[PDB]
Amino acid sequence: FDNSTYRNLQHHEYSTYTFLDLNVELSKFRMPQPSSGRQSPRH
Amino acid sequence: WSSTADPLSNLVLTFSTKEDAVAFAEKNGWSFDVEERKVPKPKSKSYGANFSWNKRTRVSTK
Numbered sequence: 436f437d438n439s440t441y442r443n444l445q446h447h448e449y450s451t452y453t454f455l456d457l458n459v460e461l462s463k464f465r466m467p468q469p470s471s472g473r474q475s476p477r478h
Numbered sequence: 479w480s481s482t483a484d485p486l487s488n489l490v491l492t493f494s495t496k497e498d499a500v501a502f503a504e505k506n507g508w509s510f511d512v513e514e515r516k517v518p519k520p521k522s523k524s525y526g527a528n529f530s531w532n533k534r535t536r537v538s539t540k
Contacts, residue, residue, distance in 0.1 A: 476536040
């Protein structure tokens with residue numbers, strides 16, 4: 436147990452694509468999306 | 479300038495009902511043509527329809 440150290444140091448090595456790379460990685464875990472019945476409101 | 483020769487060019491009369499206008503025209507001896515009143519139909523407006531989940535009425539911008 437200690438309190439002199441800072442543990443949130445991972446964000447020091449994030450690139451510009453970290454968020455979208457994480458989204459791509461998470462794409463495999465999601466449930467199928469619901470469908471409105473059309474391709475677009477303009478269809 | 480714009481010249482005319484008929485004295486009734488600017489004559490416009492106002493009546494509350496169509497029957498009064500018809501009576502006036504008949505008693506004055508004028509032949510008339512009557513157009514029925516055109517009233518806008520009652521509309522069905524819904525603000526929430528702008529954001530439909532599946533219908534075509536969902537807007538693309540505000």
